[PDB]
Amino acid sequence: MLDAFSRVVEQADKKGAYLSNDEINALQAIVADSNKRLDVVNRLTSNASSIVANAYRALVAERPQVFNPGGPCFHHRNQAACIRDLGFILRYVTYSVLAGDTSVMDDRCLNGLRETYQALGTPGDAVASGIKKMKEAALKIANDPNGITKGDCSQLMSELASYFDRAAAAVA
Amino acid sequence: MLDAFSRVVEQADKKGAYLSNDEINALQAIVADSNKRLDVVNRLTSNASSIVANAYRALVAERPQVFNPGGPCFHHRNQAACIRDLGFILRYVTYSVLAGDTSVMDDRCLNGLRETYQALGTPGDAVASGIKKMKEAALKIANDPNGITKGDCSQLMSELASYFDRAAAAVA
Amino acid sequence: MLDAFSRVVEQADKKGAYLSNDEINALQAIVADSNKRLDVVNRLTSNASSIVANAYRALVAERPQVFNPGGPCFHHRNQAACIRDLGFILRYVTYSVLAGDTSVMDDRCLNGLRETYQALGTPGDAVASGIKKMKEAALKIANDPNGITKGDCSQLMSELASYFDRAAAAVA
Amino acid sequence: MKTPLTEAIAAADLRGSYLSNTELQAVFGRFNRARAGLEAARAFANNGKKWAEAAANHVYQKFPYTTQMQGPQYASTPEGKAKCVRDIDHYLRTISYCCVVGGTGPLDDYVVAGLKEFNSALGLSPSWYIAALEFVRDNHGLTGDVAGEANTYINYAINALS
Amino acid sequence: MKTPLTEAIAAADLRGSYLSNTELQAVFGRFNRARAGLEAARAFANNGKKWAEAAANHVYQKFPYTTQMQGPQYASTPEGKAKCVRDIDHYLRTISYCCVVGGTGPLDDYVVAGLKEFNSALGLSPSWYIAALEFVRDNHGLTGDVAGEANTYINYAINALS
Amino acid sequence: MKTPLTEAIAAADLRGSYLSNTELQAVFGRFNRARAGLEAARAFANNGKKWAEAAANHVYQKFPYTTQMQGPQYASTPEGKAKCVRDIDHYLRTISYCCVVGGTGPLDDYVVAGLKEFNSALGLSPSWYIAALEFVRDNHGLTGDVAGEANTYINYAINALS
Numbered sequence A, B, C: 001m002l003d004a005f006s007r008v009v010e011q012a013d014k015k016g017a018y019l020s021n022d023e024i025n026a027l028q029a030i031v032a033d034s035n036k037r038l039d040v041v042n043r044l045t046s047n048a049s050s051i052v053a054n055a056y057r058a059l060v061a062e063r064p065q066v067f068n069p070g071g072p073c074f075h076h077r078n079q080a081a082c083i084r085d086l087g088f089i090l091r092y093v094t095y096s097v098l099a100g101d102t103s104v105m106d107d108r109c110l111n112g113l114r115e116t117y118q119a120l121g122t123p124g125d126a127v128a129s130g131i132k133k134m135k136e137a138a139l140k141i142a143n144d145p146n147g148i149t150k151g152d153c154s155q156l157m158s159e160l161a162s163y164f165d166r167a168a169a170a171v172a
Numbered sequence D, E, F: 001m002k003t004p005l006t007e008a009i010a011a012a013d014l015r016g017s018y019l020s021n022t023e024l025q026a027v028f029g030r031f032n033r034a035r036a037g038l039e040a041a042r043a044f045a046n047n048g049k050k051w052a053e054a055a056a057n058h059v060y061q062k063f064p065y066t067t068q069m070q071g072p073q074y075a076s077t078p079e080g081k082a083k084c085v086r087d088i089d090h091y092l093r094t095i096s097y098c099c100v101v102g103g104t105g106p107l108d109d110y111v112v113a114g115l116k117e118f119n120s121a122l123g124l125s126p127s128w129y130i131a132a133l134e135f136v137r138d139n140h141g142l143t144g145d146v147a148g149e150a151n152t153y154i155n156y157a158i159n160a161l162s
């Protein structure tokens, strides 16, 4: 497991040299917008349940075959196991926004998730569609003008988007 | 694990439709001859020890190289391990006649039994010969006229034969 | 696990014949020089720490890149893990001289050691160089004229050399 | 899945032996009640889709809010009603499987396993289904042992739903 | 397999270290008795096949039924007698291996491991073998330490057979 | 490795949930002291290589034997001195990483993990390094919170070294 800082430190040690001035300033920028970064991490945590529920609802509304008698995701056993999985992806996406790094998600989650769904007969292109919808919402919630100090938490959305997109690609 | 009934139910759910009338009658036939089916399962259970012992005796009488100094099955350690294995096959064959289904044998036993014997250096074509002899006896015992009500427990022998043949093929 | 004796016994059983006269004399030779064989096993055990320490020192003096910032063997974590590994090889080499057989080393150590170092990014050709140096010393120590009864513990050195060389080849 | 035959086999495989006399009777007595179970699953086969619409109407009168409130996960729209008749059918369809199998196997793996984690995560309520499931238990109107088998598994789903 | 050398190595590998002074002596003292063991295995090498027929006759007189009863697993037929001389030889052959190895390793893995599960599953009886094995223990007529090594492993097979 | 951010994530993954309010504050309060840590790692970046030669001389005066005795693992030869300035630098370099990370992660995995097993196996002594490490702790001469962060991790290496 690595974070935004511990990752640059690892890059500095591999060359046996201290963290350059330009690198000290880079992480310095990460700290400067930490408040915005935390608000992002906090708005996803709160609206966690809603995001994965609607992402599931829209996914079954887009692919009714998969969740019906015959499809891979039928039975209460599998129905609850699909929501749970989307919830997992969202949890690690949130972990990554906190750390400013995608390692936690890559190891603990994405690692062998492509082969897993494959060895179970899960569409994969259906899970990716569940993540892309789970993304649309996450951006709308995490970037709401009401209740927060006005500003431009821009580079957070772009980063948030890179995490979701990374997860969806890792299964499809 | 699945049985004669639970398997048709699984086929009905995969299409999201009830068990058709023609399917209700099919299993109805299975129940009608259950008494004969149980007698088969009970005569093999009783004469279990005899069947695997003679199957071993005839197999060593047909292949003396395998059970001598040099052959794969030498040493009391391996000698008892061969009988034990034949006993296993017979036990699951009996399980299948009870369930009217071959799933229990396919999973719990046949699953990776082909690779097992292979990774240990067991002839495979010798084990199959042990099962084919273990079959001849099983049919003679399970289908004896004395001590049982006269009738035609025919389709049971054919089924019994399909289980033994299935097991022998799965190793050779 | 097998030793010099138990290995010939295994060869005799595979043919279902007693140990021939010429084989009784062969092992008889092994017992005749056991005292020399034990002295070899005892001089390596004593000078164990020195051998692996100098082998490490010379190896870092021959390959400074590997043990510096960037190289595979940097960090106290990996630095101590390299000495420890050389120590392992030496321990099993000593075990083999005692048993007069190389089985213990082949199973407990060399088994999957080639793939291990590979899956971790260890040079392999560096470990082999550490063993070749660890050998030069082992021969000098185990074959010192002082403190021991004079004689010709020749075939022990040749055997000692075959064990070290076997280990080094098994990783490079 | 779960059935007295498959079950008796498992409890014998664990002991590393064949079936005991205490188990042989359990499997032998299964086939004795088997005819009633199949005839029960035959009843659902015919007038089973009919009980779906019948039970779908019952739940609406028990809980009026299910067909008037918003449109997130309620049977307000005609689209949501089609899902209510669908969901009830899945229950009746699975219950008939329990009659063929002679055990709560189907319900255990199909509807019970993962029941709550799903329902109480999508806004659906057990009371809606239990209500429309108790309806069928009375209105199915089966004979004797055929009605016995059907009820044993209809009420089972009610226990897990509560 | 099992031998004081291979054994002393295992008990050292577990500790993650070399041999202790308490073990070094155990291996050092092995080579001291090694000459008697090899000379014992040399005795079986020569007149070892002879003791097979000699012991095969002894068991017939001890248990007359072994050569008169039916033909399932008895030495009644001349074919079954060839297997009796064969089975006794396997015992003597393995016992000599224990002398070369200096431990009950061979007997442990070759004849002892799986002894009962096989015998008492094919109708064979231990009493037949023990009887013909006690015969050799007396009639082999070895010297001193050579006879000591041979007996230590001849009687061992008798302990496991009982 | 180890950092309040990476740590707070792990202690949340174990619970199979998101971050708690008790943890959210721990990560939120990390960024508050982050500026002092980075400025500390900035000090080592510049005059960090200088403290290496400065500390290398200090240890020689504390322990004269390190530069006069034999040549196995001492700084007697000019070659060994280059390794002493190198070894001290590795300590200072890693300590600055602890300031960027805001935790003893770097020291834990880089220098602490496997410290003793190596040193006390190659003849090197902790006292040499601790002495030259205590030197820097005083002579670095940093301001306030920048000096606080630097010292918290300079003395940490001293604790593990002892």
Ligand SMILES: *[C@H](C)C1/C(=C/c2[nH]c(/C=C3N=C(/C=C4\NC(=O)C(CC)=C4C)C(C)=C\3CCC(=O)O)c(CCC(=O)O)c2C)NC(=O)C1C
Pocket: A057, A060, A067, A073, A074, A075, A076, A079, D059, D066, D067, D072, D073, D074, D075, D076, D080, D081, D083, D084, D085, D087, D088, D090, D091, D110, D111, D122, D124, D128, D129, D132
């Ligand atoms: C009828 C009592 C009422 C109606 C219920 C309702 N359910 C859904 C959505 C779903 N229903 C199921 C049912 C199952 N799937 C299974 O695999 C099994 C076990 C075999 C069951 C019982 C599922 C999986 C869903 C989710 C997928 C889907 O959207 O269909 C809806 C739709 C609302 C929504 O999408 O959340 C409705 C309306 N509603 C009522 O108010 C009833 C009284």
Ligand SMILES: *[C@H](C)C1/C(=C/c2[nH]c(/C=C3N=C(/C=C4\NC(=O)C(CC)=C4C)C(C)=C\3CCC(=O)O)c(CCC(=O)O)c2C)NC(=O)C1C
Pocket: B057, B060, B067, B073, B074, B075, B076, B079, E059, E066, E067, E072, E073, E074, E075, E076, E080, E081, E083, E084, E085, E087, E088, E090, E091, E110, E111, E122, E124, E128, E129, E132
């Ligand atoms: C002699 C005491 C008498 C004779 C014994 C008898 N044994 C068998 C059959 C077998 N004997 C063995 C022996 C071994 N195989 C091994 O690997 C080992 C350990 C190294 C031993 C000791 C085995 C494996 C068999 C089974 C295979 C075979 O059929 O040869 C028979 C033949 C009867 C049968 O086939 O069951 C006999 C007659 N019988 C007596 O009555 C004796 C006194």
Ligand SMILES: *[C@H](C)C1/C(=C/c2[nH]c(/C=C3N=C(/C=C4\NC(=O)C(CC)=C4C)C(C)=C\3CCC(=O)O)c(CCC(=O)O)c2C)NC(=O)C1C
Pocket: C057, C060, C067, C073, C074, C075, C076, C079, F059, F066, F067, F072, F073, F074, F075, F076, F080, F081, F083, F084, F085, F087, F088, F090, F091, F110, F111, F122, F124, F128, F129, F132
């Ligand atoms: C300076 C205090 C003095 C000097 C010390 C000294 N050390 C070595 C050899 C090594 N030093 C290290 C250091 C590290 N490698 C790492 O990965 C880490 C953690 C990041 C550290 C701290 C290592 C690995 C070695 C061994 C490899 C090598 O030979 O360089 C020497 C050389 C002597 C030898 O080869 O054994 C010396 C001289 N000596 C003193 O007396 C000092 C006061």
Ligand SMILES: *[C@H](C)[C@H]1/C(=C/c2[nH]c(/C=C3N=C(/C=C4/NC(=O)C(CC)=C4C)C(C)=C\3CCC(=O)O)c(CCC(=O)O)c2C)NC(=O)[C@@H]1C
Pocket: A032, A033, A034, A035, A036, A038, A039, A040, A142, A143, A144, A145, A148, A149, A150, A151, A152, A153, F024, F025, F028
């Ligand atoms: C980006 C998604 C939106 C945005 C955010 C934004 N956030 C701040 C500053 C703060 N964020 C705080 C959040 C936390 N973290 C906690 O643990 C916690 C519990 C008390 C809170 C409230 C926080 C405390 C601050 C500082 C005080 C404040 O609320 O202003 C700011 C202002 C700039 C800054 O970095 O301080 C913004 C702009 N701004 C947007 O436009 C997006 C909608």
Ligand SMILES: *[C@H](C)[C@H]1/C(=C/c2[nH]c(/C=C3N=C(/C=C4/NC(=O)C(CC)=C4C)C(C)=C\3CCC(=O)O)c(CCC(=O)O)c2C)NC(=O)[C@@H]1C
Pocket: B032, B033, B034, B035, B036, B038, B039, B040, B142, B143, B144, B145, B148, B149, B150, B151, B152, B153, D024, D025, D028
């Ligand atoms: C086919 C192998 C042979 C054959 C069998 C056959 N079996 C029956 C009927 C019964 N079988 C019973 C067996 C059991 N199961 C038990 O657990 C148990 C303990 C009490 C018993 C005795 C059984 C009770 C019956 C019914 C009573 C009876 O014995 O008749 C029948 C008759 C037809 C039927 O299905 O009932 C047959 C014919 N018939 C053959 O020809 C084969 C040799």
Ligand SMILES: *[C@H](C)[C@H]1/C(=C/c2[nH]c(/C=C3N=C(/C=C4/NC(=O)C(CC)=C4C)C(C)=C\3CCC(=O)O)c(CCC(=O)O)c2C)NC(=O)[C@@H]1C
Pocket: C032, C033, C034, C035, C036, C038, C039, C040, C142, C143, C144, C145, C148, C149, C150, C151, C152, C153, E024, E025, E028
């Ligand atoms: C070969 C490396 C060198 C050599 C060795 C050599 N060794 C002996 C004989 C003995 N070795 C003994 C060693 C042990 N083992 C113990 O556990 C132990 C504790 C008491 C000791 C001392 C040992 C006891 C003997 C016998 C008595 C003795 O020391 O002489 C011999 C002599 C020939 C023989 O096999 O006995 C030699 C020559 N000789 C060399 O030239 C090599 C340097």
Ligand SMILES: *[C@H](C)[C@H]1/C(=C/c2[nH]c(/C=C3N=C(/C=C4\NC(=O)C(CC)=C4C)C(C)=C\3CCC(=O)O)c(CCC(=O)O)c2C)NC(=O)[C@@H]1C
Pocket: A066, A072, A073, A078, A081, A082, A083, A085, A086, A088, A108, A109, A113, A116, A120, A121, A122, A123, A124, A126, A127, A130
């Ligand atoms: C829902 C979006 C889609 C879907 C998902 C689905 N998942 C399973 C079962 C498993 N999912 C995983 C994956 C993980 N396990 C983990 O611990 C983590 C994070 C650490 C992940 C990502 C695993 C291992 C399983 C198997 C074990 C288990 O059940 O937990 C299923 C069931 C597959 C089946 O056929 O039984 C399904 C269906 N299914 C869909 O249709 C959606 C597209």
Ligand SMILES: *[C@H](C)[C@H]1/C(=C/c2[nH]c(/C=C3N=C(/C=C4\NC(=O)C(CC)=C4C)C(C)=C\3CCC(=O)O)c(CCC(=O)O)c2C)NC(=O)[C@@H]1C
Pocket: B066, B072, B073, B078, B081, B082, B083, B085, B086, B088, B108, B109, B113, B116, B120, B121, B122, B123, B124, B126, B127, B130
């Ligand atoms: C006898 C007919 C033949 C024969 C058999 C033989 N088997 C083994 C050892 C093993 N057999 C199995 C297979 C199973 N394990 C199970 O649990 C089950 C059912 C659930 C099966 C089918 C396994 C796993 C082993 C290895 C572990 C063990 O010993 O139990 C051997 C020994 C192989 C060796 O070389 O040591 C043998 C010989 N050998 C013959 O010659 C007959 C043809």
Ligand SMILES: *[C@H](C)[C@H]1/C(=C/c2[nH]c(/C=C3N=C(/C=C4\NC(=O)C(CC)=C4C)C(C)=C\3CCC(=O)O)c(CCC(=O)O)c2C)NC(=O)[C@@H]1C
Pocket: C066, C072, C073, C078, C081, C082, C083, C085, C086, C088, C108, C109, C113, C116, C120, C121, C122, C123, C124, C126, C127, C130
């Ligand atoms: C030193 C000569 C070289 C070197 C070695 C090195 N080893 C590791 C880590 C491992 N080594 C092993 C191998 C064994 N484990 C055993 O138990 C045995 C004997 C029974 C052996 C031979 C294993 C399994 C590991 C991994 C687990 C562990 O750490 O114990 C490393 C670390 C690799 C890394 O990148 O982290 C190294 C470096 N490295 C060198 O440069 C020398 C050539």
